[PDB]
Design a binder for these strands. Sequence first.
DNA 1: CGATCGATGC
DNA 2: GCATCGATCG
Length: 544
Amino acid sequence: VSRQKATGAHFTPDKLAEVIAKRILDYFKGEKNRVIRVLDPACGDGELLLAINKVAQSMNIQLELIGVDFDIDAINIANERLSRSGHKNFRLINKDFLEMLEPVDIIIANPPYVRTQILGAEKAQKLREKFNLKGRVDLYQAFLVAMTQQLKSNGIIGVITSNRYLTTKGGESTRKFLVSNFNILEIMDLGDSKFFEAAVLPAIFFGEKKNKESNVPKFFKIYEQSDIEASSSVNSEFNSLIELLEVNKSGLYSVEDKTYSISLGKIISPENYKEPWILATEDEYEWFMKVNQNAYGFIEDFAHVKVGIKTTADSVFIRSDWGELPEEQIPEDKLLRPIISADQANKWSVSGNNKKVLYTHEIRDGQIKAINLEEFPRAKNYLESHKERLASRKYVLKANRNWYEIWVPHDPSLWDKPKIIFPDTSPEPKFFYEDKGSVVDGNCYWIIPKKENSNDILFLIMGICNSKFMSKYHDIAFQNKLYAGRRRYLTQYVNKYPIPDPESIYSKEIISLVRELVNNETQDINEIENRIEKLILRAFDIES
DNA sequence: CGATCGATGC
DNA sequence: GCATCGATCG
Ligand SMILES: Nc1ncnc2c1ncn2[C@@H]1O[C@H](CSCC[C@H](N)C(=O)O)[C@@H](O)[C@H]1O
């Protein structure tokens, strides 16, 4: 990994910095008669301190600028830019802000984002114990805790981070810490606007630190809108993307080359931090709540939403060229199982393609055990070739498991059951039925019924999951998006899909219609699809 | 065990 | 400009 990657050295663009500065000073309710202390805990080359001082000078406000950064080169360049700007009252400290100073009145920040795997398992454990965090902790989550305690009560914070704390399971500690330490003023999900050169969807958090001794938090949400429906008008009286960040009306806006969907509203009861924070309008949230009330249950109550095998060496275990190998290394046909990947995914039906996985696990004496390499000589010599890469996986040997094993093989006896398969990263739901007993690749998830009767129940789930109804429910309840409108069909989200009463007459016709799309079509598939949409609306007792 | 997360990664 | 895939947490 690069130095910039491990240190999160990604500067804030000057125009985005100005946006953050203006909101901070408009939200600030301090005295402003004396020197206001401003802190940037990871100041980089000083862009945020310059941006907030520029805005404050236009208000005849005097600031004390304080910036910290553990990189001396960043400190050196920030001192040069601040000194040349003509501002005298500033101070820079070269240190680890986390420390592995008097409290300030304002914090403007864009802390580094470093994922758990780049921090290493050892340092991630220290951050969790020091700042009371859980899960796959990111470096920006630690900085959120560390910088918050440097802020005086009633002080204003304005910090941009990755938006993923809003919607991920691992963001739970951050959401809890934020709502219990701040009077949340505004959360701006910048979505896929791509203000940074880096591939990241950021969010900006504005809040007033609680006093411990009378406010409704609002939100701003902007994402690129790819599909403009016929009856939707677009506003184009804004020339720059940075200008859309001060729009105060929901709707479609186009900084030409792109059209953006902007939503404003209130965040609903963020104190329920264990669920993802939902940024939805009043109408979207009402429709979302009415579905939940009229829901019979959820997929979690009916089926196991499981991820495919996690091999941790895909190029070694998953191939299609098994036949054109040395005859001494062609694995025994018992070990080559057909495996379905995300590039074969479609709706209801799959598109054999010679793609097989070398399955290293089996059922011996009623238990799941790894295979014996002495029993499969041709498969042994093949895995002997890549032993260096396979044995270098430290986590494999720490669990007292063999170097040649698939890391997560799941249960070899469960592949035979009929199942629903769908891809994780996808802009549209592609849930299809499969009863041929093939393995599921790690880029896909798969659904088997909790009840030992796959009849009807998987077909009802499949019709729900593929529907535009559930895509609308997903975009409201589970707002985790990659670039290009790609949803994340993960266990933690699909478990929470609502399901109507499977004994309802509307549900029974969905099952028969879905059974036609699986068992048996020309372009009349959409005729049945639209019929399922109306049946789903009747099953949930709504009409949108 | 088994699902997560990605200043994505080319 | 489009769909990771392997270290990680619990
Ligand atoms: N442990 C640590 N303590 C202090 N600064 C750190 C740090 N780890 C990374 N940083 C710094 O955090 C910065 C993040 S880049 C953001 C820079 C600036 N605030 C801006 O928004 O433009 C980098 O300059 C990096 O050197």
